[PDB]
Design a protein around this ligand. Structure first.
Ligand SMILES: OC[C@H]1O[C@H](O)[C@@H](O)[C@@H](O)[C@@H]1O
Ligand SMILES: [Ca+2]
Ligand SMILES: [Ca+2]
Length: 229
């Protein structure tokens, strides 16, 4: 078991998430994301929305863990498009990849709500690495570019869904609390990538998008911990 050190500079949470100036401390928000005291609505349930929130400053942790609490809520059985969790060399405040910049250097964990390839494998959670030379394949839900994935339904759960994403000793693990209980700590293994290399310094990010179909994409909290052996 590795030691965890909470890092506030790379985190945000309620109940006073937003500053009077409408800014969230230590983070930058772009597009149509709305920051409020309880939560940030990265993408609203309106057509064609892009939202992102990124850390202002880079983090340089050999090992790290991230816990994100989010709600994806939609009227339909089918919703779009999803939310992305980022660790990349540069801020991807705006762009076509779930509200963020494409051709990133780093890893994106995509919570893809919409089955763009008609394989009936969505919603899905997809880990996609990148060195800045790959154009994300939105039409194929990046099936061809995925390092790992699991099928998990994060839409319309009674409690907030929690994602625990750990980078420790070169291994990237994603644990999911699928929001069926009031226990914060009930986690189920979703996917992992072994022996994976990512940039020494990076920005943490969360982004969401909509198209023809829209869901409200909400992040209650983003928590970052440095990890040590
Ligand atoms: O929102 C779902 C779907 O809506 C439209 O069909 C397009 O904008 C797609 O890119 C998007 O995936
Ligand atoms: Ca998709
Ligand atoms: Ca699919």
């Amino acid at each position: 078991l590795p030691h965890r050190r909470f890092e506030y500079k790379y985190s945000f949470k309620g109940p006073h998430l937003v500053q009077s100036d409408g800014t969230v401390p230590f983070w930058a928000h772009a597009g149509n994301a709305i920051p409020s005291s309880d939560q940030i609505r990265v993408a609203p349930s309106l057509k064609s929305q892009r939202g992102s929130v990124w850390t202002k400053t880079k983090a340089a942790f050999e090992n790290w863990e991230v816990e994100v609490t989010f709600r994806v809520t939609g009227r339909g059985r089918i919703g779009a498009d999803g939310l992305a969790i980022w660790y990349a060399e540069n801020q991807g405040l705006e762009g076509p990849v779930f509200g963020s910049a494409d051709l990133w250097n780093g890893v994106g964990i995509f919570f893809d709500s919409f089955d763009n390839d008609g394989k009936k494998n969505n919603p899905a959670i997809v880990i996609i690495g990148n060195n800045g030379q790959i154009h994300y394949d939105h039409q194929n839900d990046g099936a061809s570019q995925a390092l790992a994935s699991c099928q998990r339904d994060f839409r319309n759960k009674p409690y907030p869904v929690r994602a625990k994403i750990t980078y420790y000793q070169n291994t990237l693990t994603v644990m999911i609390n699928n929001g069926f209980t009031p226990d914060k700590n009930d986690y189920e293994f979703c996917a992992k990538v072994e022996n994976m290399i990512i940039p020494a310094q990076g920005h943490f990010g969360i982004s969401a998008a909509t198209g023809g179909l829209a869901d409200d994409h909400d992040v209650l909290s983003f928590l970052t911990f440095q990890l040590t052996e």
